[PDB]
């Protein structure tokens, strides 16, 4: 319902195999059992790299928080490299 979106969210399961391409996610901020940070969606989950990200500053980012995320999906490590988070 927010005007900024009506780019648009792709559910996480849509990413799989869509290599090296920009996407916007909405997801539950998990920490996977393997230890890596991750996002989850009703359709699935994906591990994320935050090492180059820029969050918006007016927020906390605790686990389990619903976060909008922009990034590039990379199939080689099955990672999602996060541009920014909000």
């Amino acid at each position: 319902r927010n005007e900024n979106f009506q780019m648009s969210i792709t559910p996480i399961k849509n990413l799989l195999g869509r290599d090296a391409q920009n996407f916007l996610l909405l997801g539950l901020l998990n920490k996977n059992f393997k230890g890596n940070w991750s996002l989850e969606d009703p359709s699935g989950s994906v591990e994320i790299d935050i090492s180059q990200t820029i969050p918006t500053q007016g927020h906390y980012y605790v686990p389990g928080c619903m976060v909008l995320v922009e990034g590039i999906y990379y199939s080689v490590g099955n990672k999602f490299h996060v541009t920014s988070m909000t």
């Binding site: 799989l16 195999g17 869509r18 290599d19 199939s75």
Partner: protein, 202 residues
Amino acid sequence: LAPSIYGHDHIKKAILLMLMGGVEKNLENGSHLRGDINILMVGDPSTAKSQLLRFVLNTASLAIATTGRGSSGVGLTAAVTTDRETGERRLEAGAMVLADRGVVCIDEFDKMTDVDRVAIHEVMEQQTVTIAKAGIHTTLNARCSVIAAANPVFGQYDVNRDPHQNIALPDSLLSRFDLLFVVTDDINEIRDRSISEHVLRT
């Protein structure tokens, strides 16, 4: 060609050139060089080999469909029958003769019994079939592009082993095909995503 088949670009290129085969040569003493292009697709299951045969069957001006088990060697070349109109022994054209100046499609080609494949050789080598039975001693024209589909001796292609060990057919038959294509359903997320979304659109 075959817009409902993803990928297989080099095969569709070869199919196009096979629909448009090169000029046949005739030389001294009536010596002959064939102009058909003979294609064998051998490979993993579910790699559109049969669908490509069915597209060719729907696209060539003159195409005859066959399948390995369903084809007799006699049913392929020509068969003797009595013409009940008169009572005389007469030849009935088989698939290779009916496809003359056309193409033949063969699905499940490696499933043929070898007394069927023994009858393939003259069509490939000489574009003709020879009859020497029932007091009928003749030679018939069978000038056509064979395109065939097969699987390896194992259910899928085994890259650990040589083509002559993967492929059931004799080298005395494989050497007669113009292009021997090996295809595989080799798993890859990007290609699987692409082929999948194409097939869903289809």
